[PDB]
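Follow-up to my post from last week.
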Amino acid sequence: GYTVAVVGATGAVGAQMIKMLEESTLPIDKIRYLASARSAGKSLKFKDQDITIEETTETAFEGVDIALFSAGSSTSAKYAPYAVKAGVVVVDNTSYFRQNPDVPLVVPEVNAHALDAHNGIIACPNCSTIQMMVALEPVRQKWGLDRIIVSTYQAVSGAGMGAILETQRELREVLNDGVKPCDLHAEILPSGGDKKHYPIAFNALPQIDVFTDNDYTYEEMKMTKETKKIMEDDSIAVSATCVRIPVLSAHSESVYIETKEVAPIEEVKAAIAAFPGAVLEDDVAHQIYPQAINAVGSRDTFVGRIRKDLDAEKGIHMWVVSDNLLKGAAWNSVQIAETLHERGLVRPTAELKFELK
Amino acid sequence: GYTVAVVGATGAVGAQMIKMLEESTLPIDKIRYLASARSAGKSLKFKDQDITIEETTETAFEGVDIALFSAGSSTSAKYAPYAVKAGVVVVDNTSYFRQNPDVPLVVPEVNAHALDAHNGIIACPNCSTIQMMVALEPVRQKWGLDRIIVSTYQAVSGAGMGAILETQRELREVLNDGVKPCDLHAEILPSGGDKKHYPIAFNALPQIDVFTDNDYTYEEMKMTKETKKIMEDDSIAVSATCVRIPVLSAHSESVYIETKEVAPIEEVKAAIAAFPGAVLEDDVAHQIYPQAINAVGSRDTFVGRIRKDLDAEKGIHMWVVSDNLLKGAAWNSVQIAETLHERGLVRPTAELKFELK
Ligand SMILES: NC(=O)c1ccc[n+]([C@@H]2O[C@H](COP(=O)([O-])OP(=O)(O)OC[C@H]3O[C@@H](n4cnc5c(N)ncnc54)[C@H](OP(=O)(O)O)[C@@H]3O)[C@@H](O)[C@H]2O)c1
Ligand SMILES: NC(=O)c1ccc[n+]([C@@H]2O[C@H](COP(=O)([O-])OP(=O)(O)OC[C@H]3O[C@@H](n4cnc5c(N)ncnc54)[C@H](OP(=O)(O)O)[C@@H]3O)[C@@H](O)[C@H]2O)c1
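User reply:
Got it. Predicted complex:
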């Protein structure tokens, strides 16, 4: 069996990493939980066993086979190269290594083949990208993809545990104390690293991550660049608007595509239904469609509202929902780890390709 | 001065119609408040005056110069034609008369010219449509509009008082009582008339109004048809996805357009800023963009996140927010009444063009 390290075990994703590993088929001989210095000493469960949390350092990875990183891009930049040097295979949830050409950016249902040539780090894509890839791959396979326009409806748990708590307390202040939403005090949202913070209670914040130089945010540009890498097709036009709404968990997306050939809607529904990881929830006569509150706790990605554009021959609209901490993060990572096991790819990398910092 | 009747004075829009009329330049000699049998005999203020609510009937409109209707489609279908027969000019905030060729469908800043030929009923468009027209008309004027794709983020007050109360109580049950969102009992949303109801708390429901036979909802098809009528251009392609989110007031929209001629973004920003009723809130260096919580209580429509599509030469994305009870309903209606007065159009229509039910 393996020694498996969860780096960021105390966070929003880390908690779900623990659950997914507890429910995994991966043969685990030893589990280790790693976090920051201030979490060291604390205990946390793996099944009915008590695990002491350890501080993440350059020397903490000796004897580890697989490390699942979910501790911020900075922690991955600092320690993942040391893990690879120690002979670990890292599965990283952060954005840091995603666009490195020596690093496979993987959704196992779409591009598992990319794992074969890994150099010790596999990147899990952005949550909003993953669920879109699960919904759209079956369509691309049969009719191609020319362009995507997406508007997202993203849950606050995507911003971490602190963002969940900020949201709940803001809502309680409005509903229980009568505070006007626009008078609320925020510390984290829309983006913890940015200069200004805004209330999310009864709001829709059209900013996720910080702004890039082309006036799209990094979140929107991640959807663009990650789609092209995962689908290994730079000709797919992708533009996004990424919005935070007062949902605790599960992202929703209004997705517009134009295919290369006309894709009959009943066939599109059937292709999506048949694709692993995608569930068709589409029966408008009975008001059936994906909903965030229904998707929470499921590894599946739910697709509905599927209909042709009113004017564009090859245009199709749909609605895509998935749990951002599961398929969007911890489940995608555990799936990758299971696939690495299945393919005999859990072993040390001889050549180190990532700079030690 | 005028005798003005507010039909549906007790509802979410009605309350704002009162506020807008109180703050209006319209010379008002007498105010009457009409509603259903449920509210008849109760009292509401107009400024310091107590006004007794009257049950709406076919004979309640004698002596009324202007009637503002915001009491549901059925109420307008039943009583507006009797008001017109009695010599009233009706400003109607329902969908019922919007597509009737004898009824101007008006946003004053866009198509006030259409008022001149009114036959006793002027329809106020759908809230989500109004704010999109204020944002897009200045762009259309200079560069044309070929197509629109919109995904909305609509507030619950759009579905009335009952839906506001339903949302507040659901959120209180989750936050104070520890109820799981999935275990909440809903009675109104997504659509009071439809067969099944779902929780909105911590959810995003991709259904507003009921479904039509093309699998778009009536809300989505209204954005399509109303746009074409208001802009007097059936060639504009419009497809919409309309989603309810947990916001009490103010709709937000992710709007994609393709213009007929390339529209430089800095010029688009200037044109929107210069357009009456539209305010540019767009400075990403300081995280300035429209927000629902900021728009509440303002008659203006706010536009930002303005940026070119990453691939389509003539494509532009933006974020449009307005208070759905103000510019989306009560302010647009009172603005229409003010414009009618300015143009000498508050007077009886000799010929009845509407069926009596
Ligand atoms: N949330 C989502 O839906 C989602 C989806 C896809 C990808 N991700 C990525 O997942 C990563 C984790 O996000 P989250 O939402 O789980 O954040 P979170 O709830 O704030 O948790 C942060 C975790 O990072 C750990 N950490 C912080 N600094 C550390 C350090 N210097 N050394 C070791 N551990 C450190 C924290 O440990 P302590 O408790 O000791 O501080 C905590 O375990 C982020 O990079 C995020 O971009 C998140
Ligand atoms: N809310 C928005 O943002 C928005 C935007 C664009 C268009 N609209 C339209 O505005 C209209 C009202 O919306 P709302 O959100 O304010 O609804 P609401 O809060 O439910 O209010 C309903 C109003 O209709 C009155 N009413 C019901 N049945 C009646 C009857 N038989 N005769 C006379 N009055 C009756 C009610 O009076 P009681 O108190 O006696 O029941 C109440 O005053 C609807 O047609 C809606 O489609 C709303």
